[PDB]
Amino acid sequence: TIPHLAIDPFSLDFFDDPYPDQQTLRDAGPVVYLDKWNVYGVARYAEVHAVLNDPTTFCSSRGVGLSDFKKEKPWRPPSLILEADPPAHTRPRAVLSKVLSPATMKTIRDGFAAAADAKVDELLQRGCIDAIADLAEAYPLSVFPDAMGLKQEGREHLLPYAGLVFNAFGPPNELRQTAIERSAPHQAYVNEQCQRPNLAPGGFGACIHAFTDTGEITPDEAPLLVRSLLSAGLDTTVNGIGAAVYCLARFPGELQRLRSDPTLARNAFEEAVRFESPVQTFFRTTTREVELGGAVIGEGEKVLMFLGSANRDPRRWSDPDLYDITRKTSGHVGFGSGVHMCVGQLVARLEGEVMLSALARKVAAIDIDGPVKRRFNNTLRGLESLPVKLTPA
Numbered sequence: 001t002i003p004h005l006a007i008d009p010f011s012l013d014f015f016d017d018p019y020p021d022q023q024t025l026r027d028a029g030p031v032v033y034l035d036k037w038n039v040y041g042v043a044r045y046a047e048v049h050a051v052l053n054d055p056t057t058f059c060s061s062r063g064v065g066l067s068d069f070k071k072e073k074p075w076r077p078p079s080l081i082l083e084a085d086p087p088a089h090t091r092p093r094a095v096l097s098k099v100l101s102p103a104t105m106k107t108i109r110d111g112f113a114a115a116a117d118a119k120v121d122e123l124l125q126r127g128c129i130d131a132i133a134d135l136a137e138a139y140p141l142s143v144f145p146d147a148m149g150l151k152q153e154g155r156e157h158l159l160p161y162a163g164l165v166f167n168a169f170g171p172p173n174e175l176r177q178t179a180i181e182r183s184a185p186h187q188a189y190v191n192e193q194c195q196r197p198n199l200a201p202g203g204f205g206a207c208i209h210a211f212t213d214t215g216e217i218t219p220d221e222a223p224l225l226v227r228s229l230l231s232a233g234l235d236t237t238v239n240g241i242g243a244a245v246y247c248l249a250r251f252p253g254e255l256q257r258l259r260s261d262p263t264l265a266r267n268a269f270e271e272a273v274r275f276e277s278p279v280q281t282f283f284r285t286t287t288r289e290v291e292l293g294g295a296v297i298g299e300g301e302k303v304l305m306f307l308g309s310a311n312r313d314p315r316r317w318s319d320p321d322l323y324d325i326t327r328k329t330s331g332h333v334g335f336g337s338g339v340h341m342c343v344g345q346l347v348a349r350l351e352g353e354v355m356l357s358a359l360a361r362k363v364a365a366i367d368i369d370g371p372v373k374r375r376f377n378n379t380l381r382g383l384e385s386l387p388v389k390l391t392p393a
């Protein structure tokens, strides 16, 4: 009843151009079986959304990578938020919600916006730049480590650590094995910075530790919650901002609409998250036998959710393969959905909005003018290099 497919959604050929295979995954049925990895796959919008909103059956506490924590040892201690189900999830989630709250955004917005404006002006003085190294990476590196309260020493480990984290949710392919092997120096740096003495008062990390006084988290939970922000809060934004710039470079008509109304910046960023889906996939594990789209899945099975596919499903989206900065984006699953929906979404949107606002006000054209290179990761979609010429407004 369930179709069996040989598509490897973690192969380099798939990463290089996933769209035909994602349509094959959607059109084969609401649920497929991926023989390459012995997992179920769910690629249409409706079923992806339903699974994400059914946490008592499609759980996170057995891991959201391929590995099942009831069968294998996790490569690092489990995340107290990502890899937990309610009720254990709830209080750690509340702490990160408050640390990354609407009220907190007020305290960082001026500096985040000023840094974005300055970066765009700096890049305009160069003209021809690499929108990854010089923009998508440089901007978050200039604001997020400081907002976390990290010391200066060791920050070179942050992007390597995040790449490792995101590769490690994948299957045990070469990308994963290479990432985990000799990763101890990156782990040691991150784990050290999670300790309270290393985090500047007033930053996100110190604020997490301050919540240990309230009874929401114990002192020994705080370092792992700092670890969550250092795992999930940098490389995601690099790929989100890179996605938005790549969209504006390829759709000049949409750049022109953004220039004419810079208040579209926030939705232009949200649409880039839908369109590229910088976080492509994650897993759940069934806690019981369950029917999904007519297919019966046994207990203890891994289920792979294709967020990028759901975000392009023609059953749900008109003109899904068009980047449209005025699209009604609500309901896209690029930040997930339900109880685990990205707790950092306000930080992500703040960074994306202020960068696109700076581009909207300062740049007249974005032209690809060198070889584009894709970056491969088991979970993240994005570019390694994006040479562009920026023309000033």
Ligand code: HEM
Binding pocket: 060, 064, 081, 082, 083, 093, 096, 100, 228, 229, 232, 233, 234, 236, 237, 239, 240, 241, 273, 278, 279, 282, 333, 334, 335, 336, 337, 339, 340, 341, 342, 343, 344, 345, 347, 348
């Ligand atoms: C464009 C940028 C981002 C994207 C696309 C993104 C995507 C996601 C997705 C899809 C999830 C859900 C995972 C699941 O359901 O298993 C998630 C969760 C999470 N994200 Fe983000 N994220 C982004 C930025 C950030 C930032 C900036 C932070 C922190 C500063 C952050 C921290 C987290 C955390 C801690 C979780 C776990 C939440 C929970 O399990 O309750 N993310 N993110």
Ligand SMILES: O=C(O)c1ccc(C(=O)c2ccccc2)cc1
Binding pocket: 064, 065, 079, 080, 081, 082, 083, 165, 169, 227, 228, 229, 231, 232, 236, 279, 281, 282, 283, 379
């Ligand atoms: O708590 C953490 O360490 C953590 C939290 C969230 C993420 C994340 O966005 C993500 C994880 C797995 C798959 C797709 C996205 C990764 C790590």
Ligand SMILES: [Cl-]
Binding pocket: 076, 187, 188, 190, 191, 227
């Ligand atoms: Cl670690």
Ligand SMILES: [Mg+2]
Binding pocket: 075, 076
């Ligand atoms: Mg260890």
Ligand SMILES: [Mg+2]
Binding pocket: 197
């Ligand atoms: Mg010291």
